[PDB]
Every structure is written in C-alpha cells, then in structure tokens.
Amino acid sequence: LLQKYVTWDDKSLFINGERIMIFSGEFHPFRLPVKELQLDIFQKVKALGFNCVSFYVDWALVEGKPGEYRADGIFDLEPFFDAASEAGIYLLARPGPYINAESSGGGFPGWLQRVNGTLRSSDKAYLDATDNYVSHVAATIAKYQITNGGPIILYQPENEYTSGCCGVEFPDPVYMQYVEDQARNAGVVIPLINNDASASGNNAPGTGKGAVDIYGHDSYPLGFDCANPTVWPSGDLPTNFRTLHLEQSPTTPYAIVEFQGGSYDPWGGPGFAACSELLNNEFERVFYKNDFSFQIAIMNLYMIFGGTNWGNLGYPNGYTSYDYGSAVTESRNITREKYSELKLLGNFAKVSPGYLTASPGNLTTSGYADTTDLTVTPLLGNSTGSFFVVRHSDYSSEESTSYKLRLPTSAGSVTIPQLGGTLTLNGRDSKIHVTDYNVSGTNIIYSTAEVFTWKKFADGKVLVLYGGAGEHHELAISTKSNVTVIEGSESGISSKQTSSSVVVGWDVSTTRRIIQVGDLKILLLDRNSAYNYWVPQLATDGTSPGFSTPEKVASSIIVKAGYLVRTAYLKGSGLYLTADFNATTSVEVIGVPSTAKNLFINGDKTSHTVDKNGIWSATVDYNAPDISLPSLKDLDWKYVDTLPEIQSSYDDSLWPAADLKQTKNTLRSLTTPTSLYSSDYGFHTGYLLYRGHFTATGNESTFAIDTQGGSAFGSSVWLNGTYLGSWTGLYANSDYNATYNLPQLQAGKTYVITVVIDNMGLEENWTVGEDLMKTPRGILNFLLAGRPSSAISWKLTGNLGGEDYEDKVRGPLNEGGLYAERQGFHQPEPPSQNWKSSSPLEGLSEAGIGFYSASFDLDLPKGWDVPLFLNIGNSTTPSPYRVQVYVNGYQYAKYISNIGPQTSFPVPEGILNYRGTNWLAVTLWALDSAGGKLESLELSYTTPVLTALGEVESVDQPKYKKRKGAYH
Numbered sequence: 001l002l003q004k005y006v007t008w009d010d011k012s013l014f015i016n017g018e019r020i021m022i023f024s025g026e027f028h029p030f031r032l033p034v035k036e037l038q039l040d041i042f043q044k045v046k047a048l049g050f051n052c053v054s055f056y057v058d059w060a061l062v063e064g065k066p067g068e069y070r071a072d073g074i075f076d077l078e079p080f081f082d083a084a085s086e087a088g089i090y091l092l093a094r095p096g097p098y099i100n101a102e103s104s105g106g107g108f109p110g111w112l113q114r115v116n117g118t119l120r121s122s123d124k125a126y127l128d129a130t131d132n133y134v135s136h137v138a139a140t141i142a143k144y145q146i147t148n149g150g151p152i153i154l155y156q157p158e159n160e161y162t163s164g165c166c167g168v169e170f171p172d173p174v175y176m177q178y179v180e181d182q183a184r185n186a187g188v189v190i191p192l193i194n195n196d197a198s199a200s201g202n203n204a205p206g207t208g209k210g211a212v213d214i215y216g217h218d219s220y221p222l223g224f225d226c227a228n229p230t231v232w233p234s235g236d237l238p239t240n241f242r243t244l245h246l247e248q249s250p251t252t253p254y255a256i257v258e259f260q261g262g263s264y265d266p267w268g269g270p271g272f273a274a275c276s277e278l279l280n281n282e283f284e285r286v287f288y289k290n291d292f293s294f295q296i297a298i299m300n301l302y303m304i305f306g307g308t309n310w311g312n313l314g315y316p317n318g319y320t321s322y323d324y325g326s327a328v329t330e331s332r333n334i335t336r337e338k339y340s341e342l343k344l345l346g347n348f349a350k351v352s353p354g355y356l357t358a359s360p361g362n363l364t365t366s367g368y369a370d371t372t373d374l375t376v377t378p379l380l381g382n383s384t385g386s387f388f389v390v391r392h393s394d395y396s397s398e399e400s401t402s403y404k405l406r407l408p409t410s411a412g413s414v415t416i417p418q419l420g421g422t423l424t425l426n427g428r429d430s431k432i433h434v435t436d437y438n439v440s441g442t443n444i445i446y447s448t449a450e451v452f453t454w455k456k457f458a459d460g461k462v463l464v465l466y467g468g469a470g471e472h473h474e475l476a477i478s479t480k481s482n483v484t485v486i487e488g489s490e491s492g493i494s495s496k497q498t499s500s501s502v503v504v505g506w507d508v509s510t511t512r513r514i515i516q517v518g519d520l521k522i523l524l525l526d527r528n529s530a531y532n533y534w535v536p537q538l539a540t541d542g543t544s545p546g547f548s549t550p551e552k553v554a555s556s557i558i559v560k561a562g563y564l565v566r567t568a569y570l571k572g573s574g575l576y577l578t579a580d581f582n583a584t585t586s587v588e589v590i591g592v593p594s595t596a597k598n599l600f601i602n603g604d605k606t607s608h609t610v611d612k613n614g615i616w617s618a619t620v621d622y623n624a625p626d627i628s629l630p631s632l633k634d635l636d637w638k639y640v641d642t643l644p645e646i647q648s649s650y651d652d653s654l655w656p657a658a659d660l661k662q663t664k665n666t667l668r669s670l671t672t673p674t675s676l677y678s679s680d681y682g683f684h685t686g687y688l689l690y691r692g693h694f695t696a697t698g699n700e701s702t703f704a705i706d707t708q709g710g711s712a713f714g715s716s717v718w719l720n721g722t723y724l725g726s727w728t729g730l731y732a733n734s735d736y737n738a739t740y741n742l743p744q745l746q747a748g749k750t751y752v753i754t755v756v757i758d759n760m761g762l763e764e765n766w767t768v769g770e771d772l773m774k775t776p777r778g779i780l781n782f783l784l785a786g787r788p789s790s791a792i793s794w795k796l797t798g799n800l801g802g803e804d805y806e807d808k809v810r811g812p813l814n815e816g817g818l819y820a821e822r823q824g825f826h827q828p829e830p831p832s833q834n835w836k837s838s839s840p841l842e843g844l845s846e847a848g849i850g851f852y853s854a855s856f857d858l859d860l861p862k863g864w865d866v867p868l869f870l871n872i873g874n875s876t877t878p879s880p881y882r883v884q885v886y887v888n889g890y891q892y893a894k895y896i897s898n899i900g901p902q903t904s905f906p907v908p909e910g911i912l913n914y915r916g917t918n919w920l921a922v923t924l925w926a927l928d929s930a931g932g933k934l935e936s937l938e939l940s941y942t943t944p945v946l947t948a949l950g951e952v953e954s955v956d957q958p959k960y961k962k963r964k965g966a967y968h
C-alpha cells in the first residue's frame, strides 16, 4: 500500500514482483569506521551467496551532546550504504533508538540518566528525548530506501520489545505505534519488521495499534558457554518454530531477524577463539539447515562480522574485541571453516526458488528415512520440487548412521539408492536432499548429494554437487540421454538407463569427477573441494555485480579458486576476475562466455589454458613480500605523569563541583549529601576522577567509599600523595565497598582525597520499566569516620567538557578524564619535546598512572591486505594494572592485567597508516603500591593476503592542539 518495491505474502518477500529468500548477516558500521574496509566486508558477505546485511546505528555515538546530531566522517552512514550498493547487498536498517548490541547504554546516550521518565515507554520525557535522533537517522535511512534507488529494503523499529516490569503495562501499543510513526514521519515507506526476543507474538499483524508489517523474532539456541565448545545440550535444537509462526503471524513470511552466528565473551571469559569453536561449521550445517526445515524466508545471522569495541563504545560486561566468533573475523579474515560451510548453504538458497513455494510438513522419524535414528522434515512441492532436511534425531549425536530414503517424485515414489549401497550421515551433519529440482528446464528427479549451485550457459548447463568424505550418493535425471564420465576415473561410478531417466551412483572422492548427461555437466565434489568454489555475478554493463535479482543470479559464472573471489565482469574480449589469495592458487572458470578470449585477474593479463571440456585454467602465484614491523620496545618513548592530582601543588579550582543537592536520576535516590553520579554532570565515558576536600580534626582514622564502574571496574584512592589502596577489580563486582586506614592527620590542615574509577561503559536496558541503563557511575556512598558527610566537598571530572565533548572527529566516547586525555596528548604529535625518556616496559615504581608517547613509521607494500595486531605480554601472573592504547588518537585497546582475556588487539588499516607515521599513546595505571610495568609490547602480523582491495585512505587523525577549556 505505501510502496510496491518490497511486498510479501505468507511464503516470502517479493522484490519488484519476484520472490527472494533473504539471507543476511549482521554488520555494525560503528565497529569498523573505515569505509574501504566496509566495502571489503560487504564483498565477503556477497561471496557467501548472501543478499542482505542488517545493521544497528548507535545513538550514543551520534548524539553525545543532547540536541546535536552528528553522523559525519567516520560515523557517516552514506558511504556504508554506497558500499552495500556497490557490493550488491540489500540492507535491513535497525536504528533503535534502543539497540542493546553489547554496546554502552544499549545505544542510549548517558544523558538519558537525567530523563524523568521510564526508558522505552510512552512517558513524554523519554519520547521527547528520542525525537531529534530518530528524525535525523530515519531521514538518512529514508533517503537510501530501495524506493529511491538505494539498498535499504526493511526497517526495524525498537529492539526486542519483549519484556516489561515495574508498573509498565507491557506491551504498550501507544508506545510502539509512536516509535513506528517516528520512522514513517521521516519518510520511511518500506516494511517495518520487529525482532521479538522470543516467539511471543508481540506487535504481530492483527494485534491492532502498534503492529509491524512483518513479525520477526530472534533465536540463540546453542547459548553462550564458549568454555565447553563441544557440548550441545539436550533440547537446544528448535523444533516448533513453524508451528509457532502459523499461530502468531501466518500471513507474513517466516523471519528470524537475529539467528545466532557466534557469541559474546565477557571480561575474564575464555576468549572469542573458543566462541568460534562453539559456533563452528558443524553448528552451522545442523542449526541453519534446521531453520530451512521451517521454510525460513528472512534469515539474518548475528553477527557475520563483529569488529571492535573501540573508543569505549562497548557495554561494561564486554571488552575491546567483538570478534564474536563470527564467519568473518575481527581482523576481516575468512579462514574459519564456518565461512566456507556457510557459503555452501548461501549458494544453495540463491538458486533454489522451489524452496519458497513448497509446502512444509511436520518433522518425521519414519516414512522418508528407514531409521528412527534420523529425523526428516519434508518441504513438498508438486511441479516446483521438494526438499528433505535430514539430521540425527538426537541432534548432538556424533554417530555414523547408514540409511535409505523413500522419496516422492513426479516420476513416482522411489527407494534410494536404487543401484545398491546406502547413504551415510556422519555425526553432527545435516543434508538437504532434493527431488524434481529444476536446472533451467532439466529436471533432476532426485539428488542425495547437496546442491552448491547450477547455471545455464550458452554452450550447456552445469550443476555442482557435493558430499562429505566416505559418503555414497545417487542422482537421477529426466532424460533419454546416457551418462558419460568426461573428467576423472570411472571407478565407483555406476549407472542405469530407464525409459525416461538415467540413474547415476557415485562415491565421494577428493578427486573431482565430471559427468555429462545430454547438455548438462555435473561436478561431483567432496565438501572440502566445494569450499574452494565461488559463484560471482558476471556484470556485462560496468564492473559492479548488482543486487541478487533473478536475471543477475542467472548470469553468474562458476570459479574454483582459493581464499576469495569478489567479482567478475565481461568487457570486450576480456573476462575480468577480482579475487584475493593467501597461497599459490589454481584458478578454474566454468561458463566462460563465448566472446571471451583473454583472462584478467585483479586487472592483470593472465595466461590461461582451455581443457577438452571448455574449462579455463590459470595459476596465480603467491610470494609474500617482506613485512618490516618496528620493534615497539626500541622506540623513543616519552613519559609524563598523568596523575598530577596527587601532588600537593595541584590546583583543581576549575574542576566542576559535585555539589548538586538533587539527582536527576530516577533509578537511585542519593545516599550522599550531593550527587556523585558522573552522568548528573555530563560525564559518561572513560576514567573518572573525584577530589574530596576536607579540613582535618586530627582524630581521623578511616575513610570508607563505595565506588561503582560496572563489571570488572577498578578504583584507586589517595589522601594527598599518600596511597590508601585500590579495588583491583573482578568481573563479579560492578561496585565495591572499601574501608581505608588513614595516616595521622594534622588538626586544621586541608586534605584532598583523590579517587580514580574505571568506567566500563553504561548498562543495557533489556527489560522495559527496569531502567537499568540509568545505573550510575561514580561514588555511591562514603564515610569519613567521626565526621559528617558534609565535611567533604567534592569535585569531579570525566572527559573534558562532558557532553560538550572536545573531539568531534573521533566521537563522544573515545577519551576519558585523565590529565593527558583532557589535554589531548593522546593525539598525533603531542608536545613531548621536554618530557622524560621512559618506556611503559620500565613503568612505575609506585601506585599511579603514567602516560607514554612514541611514533613509528610503516612502509608496507601496496596490493597486500596485511592484518596488524598490538600485543601486550602476559606470560606470567601479573601485578594488577590497567592499560589503554590510543593509535593515532583512536582508543583501540583496553587491558586489565589481572582479569583479561585479551592480549592481542587488531588495529585496522585506515586507523594505522601503512605508508606513513603512526602514533601510540599508552596509559599505564598501576593499582599496586609497588607500581607496575608491561612485560612486553609488540606489533605483529598474520598471513599477508594478495588483495584486489583498492587503497585504504587514512581516516581523519586530528593532531594535538592546546585546549583552552582544560583545567591548567
């Protein structure tokens, strides 16, 4: 009704009147703020066979100052959308306002701690607070809708609006209608889709006011126990999802808006390498094919690429990395076996239209397969073909199971295999067997081996099939032609002709066979060989693949290669490929246009040969260049003390006074005489400092303090220059009560208590009504024994200027409250000429905080994608210390020696200057009376990739400039 570009029925979306299965990956632009690398991710997603990406926008990063929306430069969404368009990827836009996303505040800016109203409710104070943000971000989204020639096809209002408490009459139809109307009022006409955290029917079509267009829900069924990555708990495989769908939203396509693609990992967790093992290739093939058993038509994987929680953007439970164990790693590599496995399923879905028009049946333990050890879920079509999802009935089983099938076909029901032998399902695997499968007018009566892809070319048809090692498979084709083996041995290939078919049996081998039946060639592959195949769209007008439309899907070619094939196009007599290589690679092209006479790879003329079956072959040699990385320990390190506050000369007269008698925080009433909540004063991010002035009686004994920074925070306390102690932190503690013994004080003299508190980020707000994002940061309680609370007058600081934040280029979260950060010394070219020469490897000999600066040059070669990492040593149990590392002003490492787990910190090209000068600024906070130092600090690299990527422009890296608003 509002537009005709994106429509739907009960089975699927239609894009311009044509059915499409939306297969999407989650990618957050704020977690990879380099536009050329955003294109890289999109191309890697397109190469999976996917057609869509889903993204959040993080409000906290783009309206750090209330009333000043800023989504420019590294936060600009427009180049992100243009990269999607260039890669041929549609978009699902998810701007919140609430996003969760393991991000600080769940996306909410810290100034929402001053809103007198329930967050995510119809309370006017909350709704008013969101209006400026939504009117801006939804306008930008509206501009790039498919209706205007852009990539954006779906819009999600809100996020997991599923749980309420604490007086909210949940679900509130007035609230969701308001949120939906905000988007519509900004020009969004595309369909609205929700993402209910459970299949709870919230806001489904037919619920009236507040209903979305398409009901969606989320699912993370294998959970998050990354420490036990081989354990698949009983009952974790979903079976009822289609049943629930038909009850909850039968008129719309079945949609999972976030299906598990990895896992979060908290401070002190096992690490994302473990998460990648839990959500590995086996998880994908069993759980994702299980989603196909429900006839899922919109499927988005959270995350496909996670990136990095740089500049304090992450929530307090998480650390710097957001690798997530996803198919594309944090450093952008696609080496994980789960990437290649996922590509097999994405490419199946891309070419199998009968999947969407079939009639799904209930799961079975008999009737299709001949054993109750297997479960088969049928999707039955008459003329349009059927699909049979096979798995172990006990989904965690690692047993090898022999079986036979009884399948319905247009030629009659058949027991498979016909020619002898049995099929095998080896352990944690699942197959989609097909019947009456259409290969451009050629009917595949059945195939037990799975379809990777098929194409019609000018000189014939090609079908690509694969099985796992040790499997026997069989197929049958509607034809009067016989079968001929045209590549590979005839060994273990059996066949029979009937009146109207040919039947072919085969055993999986590491050596490819190609068979020919009439004008159809069939590749018979093992899974590990199929991992190396790619199906780029072949452009004939320009160089860009275009979106996954029926015509552009049909025009694709089949390329065997190695690490990556990005694109293909035909220009005159030239066939052009763009691809990446991490080893010497044999390239084969199947379906070369008749007019192509010359091969180009990444623009370079490349020799080729043609075999007797018309396949082009070429070789791309890999010879990694010398990568010369400077020794970080040998740099000319300059040091400055970044806790001058504990010197008796320090003058804090320009610091904000923490003197508000009333809090604007509705969640927690004050238990101190004035507010010491950082967000009451506009300080939401990074290290916080508090200074408490009093005049001593001389009879003081102890000072007690309750500090709160979120999970794994630490704090340190001094009385003038005398170290009192630290809370060194635990993941289990978001606050801590300490009682410190004081030295003997002199009656009538003034003293200042300096408190440093690590703010780990603001809490999320998952349950509507609970207002947990309002959880304060700072000092909750204090008691100077024998003195009234009012004896201490407090000052505080976070990032200089608070909400009037200094760095408009790097955003409102990047820098905290340390002296060196307040001065802007973390940026390139600090005023360090007269600073002392000292290294973070030398470090501190007492409790305190040091700031260290050094530059280094890189001269890495053009045409190579080279992942670089910062490494902080932890070979033996350390003393407690905390580190931040700024790279050209951008914070790309937060490190807690005693909690971990992260020691390896990837930093992307664009943040790093590969042919230029780079700046490291390192803060070292020793939470120990004996001080602390780094064990080691090193740059490293992983496998250089010979890349098709264009040059990466360095992002804006503002140099140090004296700040007039500083407290000096």
Ligand SMILES: *[C@@H]1O[C@H](CO)[C@@H](O[C@@H]2O[C@H](CO)[C@@H](O[C@@H]3O[C@H](CO[C@H]4O[C@H](CO)[C@@H](O)[C@H](O[C@H]5O[C@H](CO)[C@@H](O)[C@H](O)[C@@H]5O)[C@@H]4O)[C@@H](O)[C@H](O[C@H]4O[C@H](CO)[C@@H](O)[C@H](O)[C@@H]4O[C@H]4O[C@H](CO)[C@@H](O)[C@H](O)[C@@H]4O[C@H]4O[C@H](CO)[C@@H](O)[C@H](O)[C@@H]4O)[C@@H]3O)[C@H](O)[C@H]2NC(C)=O)[C@H](O)[C@H]1NC(C)=O
Pocket (backbone or CB within 6 Å): 271, 272, 273, 274, 277, 323, 329, 330, 331, 332, 333, 335, 867, 871, 872, 873, 875, 903, 904, 906, 936, 938, 940, 942, 943
């Ligand atoms: C694709 O992207 C991925 C994500 O971005 C990326 O994965 C990341 O890769 C980096 C670099 O390899 C990882 O950091 C390293 O991790 C090492 C520990 O992990 C290994 O060992 C574990 C325990 O045995 C294994 O569980 C683990 O396997 C798991 O993870 C693998 C992926 O990492 C995966 O493939 C497996 O299937 C599995 O799931 C893994 O094998 C750690 O040792 C290493 O630190 C050393 O190296 C640094 C330089 O790179 C140094 O700065 C540092 O000081 C360490 O060097 C010292 O120790 C080494 C080993 O003992 C020695 O060889 C060195 O010479 C050196 O020795 C000195 O110091 C010693 C004290 O430590 C001392 O004993 C000696 O005397 C000497 O003085 C580093 O932290 C990171 O963890 C990965 N991240 C994730 C999320 O996985 C992947 O690399 C990308 N791939 C490509 C191709 O690009």
Ligand SMILES: *[C@@H]1O[C@H](CO)[C@@H](O[C@@H]2O[C@H](CO)[C@@H](O[C@@H]3O[C@H](CO[C@H]4O[C@H](CO)[C@@H](O)[C@H](O[C@H]5O[C@H](CO)[C@@H](O)[C@H](O)[C@@H]5O)[C@@H]4O)[C@@H](O)[C@H](O[C@H]4O[C@H](CO)[C@@H](O)[C@H](O)[C@@H]4O[C@H]4O[C@H](CO)[C@@H](O)[C@H](O)[C@@H]4O[C@H]4O[C@H](CO)[C@@H](O)[C@H](O)[C@@H]4O)[C@@H]3O)[C@H](O)[C@H]2NC(C)=O)[C@H](O)[C@H]1NC(C)=O
Pocket (backbone or CB within 6 Å): 276, 277, 278, 280, 281, 282, 334, 335, 336, 337, 340, 528, 531, 532, 562, 563, 564, 582, 583, 943
């Ligand atoms: C250039 O780019 C290339 C990509 O284009 C890139 O190539 C890829 O490289 C990665 C490794 O980085 C490959 O993934 C690994 O593959 C390993 C080899 O097995 C594969 O190939 C065999 C044939 O050669 C197959 O037989 C094998 O199938 C079997 O195993 C599958 C996986 O378990 C299973 O699903 C199948 O059904 C079948 O049973 C497979 O296809 C593979 O061993 C390895 O798996 C381990 O690591 C994964 C995490 O990285 C885990 O998810 C997985 O469970 C395995 O974990 C084990 O090993 C880890 C250490 O690495 C430990 O941490 C774990 O605890 C665990 O170890 C325990 O269990 C072991 C049993 O497996 C046991 O022996 C141990 O003692 C211990 O008890 C992983 O999947 C990928 O296949 C390559 N892709 C392509 C397309 O080639 C290349 O590396 C790049 N080059 C450079 C230089 O950068």
Ligand SMILES: *[C@@H]1O[C@H](CO)[C@@H](O[C@@H]2O[C@H](CO)[C@@H](O[C@@H]3O[C@H](CO)[C@@H](O)[C@H](O[C@H]4O[C@H](CO)[C@@H](O)[C@H](O)[C@@H]4O[C@H]4O[C@H](CO)[C@@H](O)[C@H](O)[C@@H]4O[C@H]4O[C@H](CO)[C@@H](O)[C@H](O)[C@@H]4O)[C@@H]3O)[C@H](O)[C@H]2NC(C)=O)[C@H](O)[C@H]1NC(C)=O
Pocket (backbone or CB within 6 Å): 266, 267, 268, 269, 270, 730, 731, 732, 874, 876, 877, 878, 896, 897, 898, 899, 900, 901, 902, 903
């Ligand atoms: C450098 O090297 C050093 C030396 O090796 C490293 O030091 C080690 O660091 C380890 C990781 O931080 C640390 O282990 C931790 O020990 C604490 C006990 O003090 C323990 O709580 C931790 O385990 C929990 O937390 C982690 C995440 O931080 C989880 O992965 C784990 O499953 C545990 O989770 C439980 O507690 C959480 C917090 O309360 C809950 O959120 C969670 O749901 C779960 O709760 C259940 O269990 C609780 C009891 O455990 C129970 O109360 C609750 O009701 C629930 O049922 C973790 O094991 C080592 O102690 C430390 N070793 C030494 C010698 O110091 C250092 O990290 C390295 N540094 C770097 C940078 O790599």
Ligand SMILES: *[C@@H]1O[C@H](CO)[C@@H](O[C@@H]2O[C@H](CO)[C@@H](O)[C@H](O)[C@H]2NC(C)=O)[C@H](O)[C@H]1NC(C)=O
Pocket (backbone or CB within 6 Å): 647, 648, 649, 650, 651, 652, 720, 746, 749, 750, 751, 752
């Ligand atoms: C503790 O530190 C404070 C300042 O942080 C010191 O305050 C000074 O006190 C002297 C008088 O002794 C004044 O003349 C100065 O103006 C104060 N300086 C500042 C910056 O306020 C205080 O003396 C220290 N306490 C002790 C016992 O040494």
Ligand SMILES: *[C@@H]1O[C@H](CO)[C@@H](O)[C@H](O)[C@H]1NC(C)=O
Pocket (backbone or CB within 6 Å): 243, 362
């Ligand atoms: C399929 O399963 C549903 C849900 O349990 C049930 O209501 C229905 O009877 C089943 N249909 C058939 C044809 O067995």
Ligand SMILES: *[C@@H]1O[C@H](CO)[C@@H](O)[C@H](O)[C@H]1NC(C)=O
Pocket (backbone or CB within 6 Å): 383, 384, 438, 439, 440, 441
């Ligand atoms: C098979 O595909 C051809 C063209 O690719 C089409 O004309 C025909 O309708 C399809 N057949 C079925 C049964 O879907």
Ligand SMILES: *[C@@H]1O[C@H](CO)[C@@H](O)[C@H](O)[C@H]1NC(C)=O
Pocket (backbone or CB within 6 Å): 482, 483, 484, 485, 495
């Ligand atoms: C069909 O091909 C097979 C070999 O692939 C052969 O045994 C058989 O004789 C052929 N049939 C005819 C009628 O030529």
Ligand SMILES: *[C@@H]1O[C@H](CO)[C@@H](O)[C@H](O)[C@H]1NC(C)=O
Pocket (backbone or CB within 6 Å): 116, 663, 664, 665, 666
């Ligand atoms: C919120 O507003 C109510 C009603 O005006 C007022 O009583 C209350 O003090 C306010 N609370 C905060 C924390 O500002």
Ligand SMILES: *[C@@H]1O[C@H](CO)[C@@H](O)[C@H](O)[C@H]1NC(C)=O
Pocket (backbone or CB within 6 Å): 699, 786
């Ligand atoms: C001084 O402190 C001691 C020990 O707490 C206590 O006995 C005494 O009451 C204090 N003096 C005054 C004047 O409060």
Ligand SMILES: *[C@@H]1O[C@H](CO)[C@@H](O)[C@H](O)[C@H]1NC(C)=O
Pocket (backbone or CB within 6 Å): 706, 733, 735, 736, 737
């Ligand atoms: C610190 O003390 C306060 C007040 O008694 C209490 O509410 C809080 O839970 C305590 N914190 C911890 C971490 O035990």
Ligand SMILES: [Cl-]
Pocket (backbone or CB within 6 Å): 819, 822, 823, 966, 967, 968
């Ligand atoms: Cl200052």
